């Protein structure tokens, strides 16, 4: 592998798309590697980590309970609802909805939770309240994945998303238990977690949320480190590439390979 920056460049030229990337020390917030870190990218499903952050802040404040059962109707469901479509009769707890959103990328679960936090405008207000003045959610699932060229809606930057994920996981803005829960939901990702582990060297920690949208948009926010520890936040977004899903996945994996190969840095 080339050095990470060189691999990222190669990825842009092979994908004919824009890559944005940041590697950040989880403990200190040190930015180690940055590429287009201040450019906008569609969040896609990665927004669901922030969403569950807002939910947990409500729980901490006594305005919400993870146990609270939410009942919903079929008319409420949107495209890709693998868990929520199974519980029309019996409902799902707020905590179950969070797990379905982060671990199983359930879109209707995400919308149900969005309802509880004041919708896209409420989640955006929450971002401002934790000092993220860049990330914005404007739409619900699934329109938020539209990824129109140049459209600022539903976007973040690698730098903002990394800083925000660090704030949610470690800054004591959330309670100890809530920080632990948000981390655990990312540890439990079923969409990409088990696949990533299958290709990581022994000893490497992974927790993640992945996202996918239109026009090539792909992304991952992750915690990664050797010695079974979450040492770094890695945020990678791709946009405006015509490439196959498989090659987008491979290119993201290649940037990861470069990070691992050149870790001691
Ligand atoms: O010397 C370091 C290591 O080099 C190789 O490991 C390879 C591994 O065999 C390959 O499968 C992976 O591909 C990359 C897999 C990454 C998967 C996605 C990563 C995510 C996580 C963070 C967010 C972005 C993407 O590269 C590493 C590093 O070369 C050797 O196989 C391994 O024995 C050795 O310990």
């Amino acid at each position: 592998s080339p050095q990470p920056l060189e691999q990222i460049k190669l990825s842009e030229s092979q994908l004919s798309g824009r890559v944005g990337m940041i590697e950040m020390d989880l403990a200190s917030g040190r930015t180690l590697t940055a590429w287009r870190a201040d450019e906008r990218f569609p969040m896609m499903c990665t927004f669901k980590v922030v969403l569950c952050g807002a939910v947990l802040a409500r729980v901490d404040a006594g305005d919400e309970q993870l146990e609270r059962k939410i009942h919903y109707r079929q008319q409420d469901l949107v495209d890709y609802s693998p868990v929520s479509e199974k519980h029309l009769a019996d409902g799902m707890t707020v905590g179950e909805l969070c797990a379905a959103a982060i671990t199983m990328s359930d879109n209707s679960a995400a919308n149900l939770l969005l309802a509880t936090v004041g919708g896209p405008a409420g989640l955006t207000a929450f971002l401002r309240q934790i000092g993220d003045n860049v990330t914005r959610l404007d739409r619900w699932e699934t329109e938020l994945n539209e990824a129109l060229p140049g459209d600022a809606r539903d976007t973040t930057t690698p730098a903002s998303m990394a800083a925000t994920l660090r704030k949610l996981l470690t800054s004591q803005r959330l309670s100890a238990r809530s920080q632990r829960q948000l981390l655990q939901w990312m540890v439990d990702d079923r969409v990409a977690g088990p696949l990533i582990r299958s290709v990581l060297p022994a000893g490497w920690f992974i927790a993640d949320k992945t996202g996918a949208g239109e026009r090539g948009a792909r992304g991952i926010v992750a915690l990664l480190g050797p010695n079974n520890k979450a040492e770094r936040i890695v945020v990678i977004y791709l946009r405006d590439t015509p490439a196959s899903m498989a090659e987008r996945n491979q290119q993201i994996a290649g940037i990861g390979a470069a990070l691992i190969e050149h870790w001691q840095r």
Side-chain angles (χ1 to χ4, degrees):
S1 288
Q3 304 226 251
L5 244 20
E6 296 307 310
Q7 176 58 229
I8 287 153
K9 296 166 177 175
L10 215 60
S11 291
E12 289 213 342
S13 64
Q14 288 170 194
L15 286 169
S16 293
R18 185 182 306 282
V19 176
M21 178 277 189
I22 198 94
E23 174 188 35
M24 178 181 282
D25 189 279
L26 178 61
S28 71
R30 181 180 42 150
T31 293
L32 291 72
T33 311
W35 170 260
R36 305 198 188 276
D38 293 326
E39 300 187 34
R40 287 193 177 279
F41 295 83
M43 282 187 283
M44 311 153 292
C45 326
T46 70
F47 97 93
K48 296 177 190 181
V49 178
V50 178
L51 170 64
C52 292
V55 172
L56 292 163
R58 293 171 28 86
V59 178
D60 287 347
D63 296 328
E64 184 56 278
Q65 304 151 315
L66 294 183
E67 290 88 347
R68 180 175 67 103
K69 183 84 77 45
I70 294 186
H71 292 271
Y72 51 92
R73 288 172 172 239
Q74 191 163 353
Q75 312 96 81
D76 300 326
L77 298 183
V78 295
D79 185 29
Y80 200 70
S81 297
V83 190
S84 54
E85 78 181 23
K86 294 201 220 274
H87 297 104
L88 292 171
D90 64 316
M92 286 177 68
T93 71
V94 169
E96 281 187 304
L97 289 166
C98 290
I102 287 177
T103 76
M104 297 281 268
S105 230
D106 193 305
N107 284 328
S108 298
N111 279 350
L112 291 161
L113 289 168
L114 259 182
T116 72
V117 302
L123 188 58
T124 300
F126 171 75
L127 282 153
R128 303 293 175 266
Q129 151 169 168
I130 68 174
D132 185 333
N133 296 310
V134 174
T135 305
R136 57 183 287 189
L137 195 74
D138 296 277
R139 289 172 294 180
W140 302 72
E141 288 290 359
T142 59
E143 294 76 27
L144 69 81
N145 303 299
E146 194 180 22
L148 289 172
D151 183 354
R153 290 175 296 175
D154 307 303
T155 58
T156 190
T157 68
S160 304
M161 183 54 76
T164 286
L165 176 64
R166 186 169 168 272
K167 289 169 179 179
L168 290 172
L169 293 167
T170 72
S171 74
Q172 305 184 280
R173 282 175 174 86
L174 302 179
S175 74
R177 203 183 182 223
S178 285
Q179 282 185 341
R180 295 203 262 273
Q181 174 69 97
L182 190 52
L183 171 62
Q184 190 61 47
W185 281 326
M186 296 182 69
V187 169
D188 280 334
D189 176 39
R190 295 303 153 214
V191 171
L195 177 64
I196 289 162
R197 278 180 198 102
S198 78
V199 297
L200 278 176
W204 287 75
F205 181 111
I206 182 73
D208 69 88
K209 177 84 200 78
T210 58
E214 295 301 295
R215 281 158 271 276
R218 193 68 173 117
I220 186 171
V221 299
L223 306 178
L224 181 67
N227 304 311
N228 279 302
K229 173 171 136 280
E231 191 187 337
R232 300 187 195 159
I233 291 167
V234 177
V235 174
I236 299 168
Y237 289 110
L238 316 178
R239 67 179 303 160
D240 298 307
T241 159
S244 69
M245 293 185 28
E247 280 159 283
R248 282 178 279 148
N249 290 341
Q250 291 164 19
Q251 295 285 179
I252 291 177
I255 297 167
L259 289 168
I260 291 159
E261 179 159 313
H262 300 268
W263 190 260
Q264 289 199 42
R265 161 203 40 74

